[PDB]
Design a binder for this molecule. Structure first.
Ligand SMILES: CCOC(=O)c1ccccc1C(=O)O
Lengths: 291, 291
């Protein structure tokens, strides 16, 4: 169990900002509660960073920073029900400022109003419209979208790399982290239903394989996969990196001791979380600079 | 004056541990106050990172992380009078953790007991003995030493890049920052003089101790030069980037509004300083990806 007082403090502040009763509350109510949480922890925008919104392949997007030879496409998390351009704004802004690469955040369609495969179709639509060298990165459900995009766009259009931040990649639940972290801090459980049911293929039945179940991972972009140790999805990161290397893809698994799911919001009060984001930025830069 | 409350608090905490009259104390007392201030701000080491002390080229060094194809040589600051392996330990450890590059910190000999060119000879000793592709980085007087190394090793030989963090580079003192920031927090123009006597006594100054006065800069490694805006030394960064581009060298100038000299120690409590270090890490990673 977590003993780092900084991240116990972060956990306490997240729970206080986010009363654990949001569930059959309403998708409308969960979106409101999630933004109120995000605002507690939100950092300031870097002054001087240019930021504007723009439709790209029919999907609303937010663009951070000046045009660059290599970009970063960021796909936010939220279990395909919550989140948007404002929920992950400061993370994208800091990626842009630190790397000097232009960042494009994708406001993909959310369920229950738009069920799968709307989310991956929107990501593919932005990716195909951008038609440029780019690293792709995402957290949680947005990490799964990032992984699925790479798998569906192999060949010339492949991203230069995939940076996956505590992703859920479709593990079947049998891995140890689902046991060891079943009551992990910041886990809502009542979200897993909203995210499996309707939302995903568990909504009108459909195969459309999730990354951990595709068998030909050969040729997809090199991966940097970072997990929270205290998170049931931890071993999805372990498992996907192990499968990626068996396919001859370069991939690294970084597991973060003492951190829960969602810890990017703790980077302004936790040394552990801040170091993790520093490593995430360096992995992005590593993929972007071509070699 | 600075108005960012986060930075003002950092300055208040610094001044309580390292009173501005320490710059004029004896070397031994100055060293004790500097070490005490370092302890106030020191972050924890990454728990999984291998760290060991080793003499390299005869000079005692500290090595962070496993051996890597590209390394990072970090040269600590402290006006050539204070500092050491422990004073900058957490910065080095965080570079190694974030980049995956091995970091070598150099415990060069200190003034007033060891006059120039002891410091640059110690850095050359380590560099030559390493015999390794590497990026060189340093803060303040350590940035001057990294710039002086690049100018003295322009053959086989050369750093892959130079990351200079609020460096003093031998500006003559007439640029606007020396007046506008003469009474700046944490570093005044008058403190500059005390340390200069401590490095050369009162003899003739070796041209290599003044990179901004060196006539030919043609083939030095490309540079990322970040300055604190509220720092008398700020325009040394602006000036050197200008002179480097006039010599065909690629150079980026980043200036940091609302930050004083020494802001690396504020990265755990200041959004501005935290983002600056994120950019510094990315610049290192940019330069490192080669050989
Ligand atoms: C004691 C902290 O060091 C200094 O203030 C300092 C003073 C003069 C020149 C450089 C530095 C520096 O290397 O930072």
């Amino acid at each position: 169990m977590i003993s780092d007082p900084q991240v116990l403090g972060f956990i306490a502040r997240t729970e206080a900002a986010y009363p654990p009763e949001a569930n059959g509350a309403s998708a409308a109510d969960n979106r409101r509660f999630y933004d109120a949480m995000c605002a507690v922890f939100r950092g300031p925008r870097p002054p001087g960073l240019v930021v504007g919104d723009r439709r790209i392949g029919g999907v609303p997007c937010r663009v951070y920073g000046a045009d660059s030879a290599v970009s970063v496409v960021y796909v936010h998390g939220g279990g395909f029900v919550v989140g948007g351009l404002d929920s992950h704004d400061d993370v994208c802004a800091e990626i842009a400022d630190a790397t000097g690469l232009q960042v494009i955040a994708i406001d993909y369609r959310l369920a229950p109003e738009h069920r799968w495969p709307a989310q991956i179709q929107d990501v593919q639509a932005v990716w195909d419209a951008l038609d440029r060298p780019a690293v792709i990165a995402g957290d949680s459900a947005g990490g799964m979208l990032s992984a699925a995009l790479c798998l569906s766009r192999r060949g010339q259009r492949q991203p230069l790399g995939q940076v996956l931040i505590y992703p859920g990649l479709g593990g079947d639940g049998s891995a140890p982290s689902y046991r060891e972290n079943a009551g992990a801090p910041l886990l809502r459980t009542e979200d897993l239903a909203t995210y499996h049911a309707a939302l995903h293929g568990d909504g009108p039945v459909d195969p459309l394989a999730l990354p951990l179940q595709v068998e030909d991972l050969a040729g997809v972009a090199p991966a940097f996969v970072v997990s929270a140790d205290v998170d049931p999805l931890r071993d999805d990161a372990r498992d996907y990196v192990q499968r990626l290397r068996a396919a001859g893809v370069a991939a690294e698994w970084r597991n973060e001791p003492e951190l829960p799911h969602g810890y990017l919001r703790a980077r302004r009060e936790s040394d552990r979380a801040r170091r993790s984001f520093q490593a995430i930025l360096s992995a992005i830069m590593r993929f972007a600079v071509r070699g």
